[PDB]
Amino acid sequence: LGNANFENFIGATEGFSEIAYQFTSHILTLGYAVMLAGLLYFILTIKNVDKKFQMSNILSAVVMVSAFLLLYAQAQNWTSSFTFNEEVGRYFLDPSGDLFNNGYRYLNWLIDVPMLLFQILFVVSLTTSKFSSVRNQFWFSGAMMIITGYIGQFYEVSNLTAFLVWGAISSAFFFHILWVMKKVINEGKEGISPAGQKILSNIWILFLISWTLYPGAYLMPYLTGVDGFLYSEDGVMARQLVYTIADVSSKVIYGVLLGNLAITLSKNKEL
Template identity: 30%
Template sequence: MIPDSLTQIQYDTIYNVFSLVIASQLFTSVFLVICLPRVLPRYRQAMTVAAIVCGIAAYHYFRIFNSFTDAFVTDAVGGRGSYSQVAGASFNEGYRYVDWLLTVPLLLLELVAVLALARKVQSSLLTRLIPAAALMIALGYPGEMASDNLTRGIFGLLSSIPFAYILYVLFVELTRSLERQPATVRKTISLLRLLLLATWGVYPIAYLLPGIGIDGSDAWVGLQIGYSVADILAKCLYGLIIYRIARMKSFADDQTFANSELSLEDAASFKRSTTNS
């Protein structure tokens, strides 16, 4: 539940965290677009999707930021004091869920696309993963909007079912694909799955704060910080790792491309590491 008032420190903290997320998402998106020519064409779809994810997140955080500054104002001289919620205005948490509804399925698409699996395997994975991701977000939204912990807990439990299914597919089904990946990127892909698990794990922890006795403005501020940090890791850092995987796979697929991108010494070193693996 959105608090009626925030202290100066709480307001400044959320203000600065939202600013950090906007900058992170926006410039990660720009970086990924600029780097598209640095990978082979077959991996540019994954890079493009990663840039779109960060772009969507940057847009929605602009909306979240504006909603926050419109919802809380202060009458203190010089703008330094406690902030109260404006009558008739409210912070719109819905922007965050619209963002997740769009970006979470795309995050899964990024991972599947960069693996460059056979078309039939890709279709099978996406057919299972994307509807489960959409269902997870759709079930979490009513709980987030609920004013009582019972309703929040019920919908949190329901949304955890597709969440667990997604993790099962990622950690069991995708393990089989690792054998078909270049040896140089297997470890990175495995770490990427762990990053997805770690960052997605932040969301339910933040979601559950009101239900474990942390309530009022402290819980709400913790919720916003937790969601924001998780969004940076799950979108920006995730996208940069996707770029790294795409680069490594491009070098493994085409030695001429590797020679053009790397110095001769680095290209030879990369070729030796691939051969030894």
């Protein structure tokens, strides 16, 4: 019953404190709420950039749609999966619920990772690289990263070595994506205004950090060891919190910066 994931495992054994249960619930709600807000932002501001850049706004909006819907479903899956026991005063896994399921989040990643990588190619111009090459490489490596991570995700309770080995494999595809993105951003800096170069530098830093947060949260409950402080409901809170910080940063803030970058490259900005 507490076999699928670390959330259920904890939920089925120690249970969650009211703080943990409520905090995790609140943070997941904030997550999907921000997505909805972002959806409207990206719809409303689309006329602020030239036609040639609008595919980036379009991909942002779509990412917002998928992340709102799936994070909303994730938020409900958390709350409905754990119920309060008066005798002990903690929340436990509910046999009559459907149990906490990582599926919503990983599906969201599968859908969104290729669009996010894709959309910067409609703002920035490449230099010595082919569009189709960059695109195909993002999409393959991106697909493999989530797939492999999702494989590892099944063994987090039952086989911690499979969990890490697969996560390592996933980290290999991630490293490759970083490497392509580096080339993309540096080629995109050439020729453009220093104001656009500056925004591109910010996008690199945002991208590097916010995406590295995901394997951070994947590893979170074991960052202190087998009997460590994080190997608890605290690890769940931290993991869920980091995932949410990452989602907002990699989707909404990334989208906003690309929007601002697009405006810098506008037709009437040219002499």
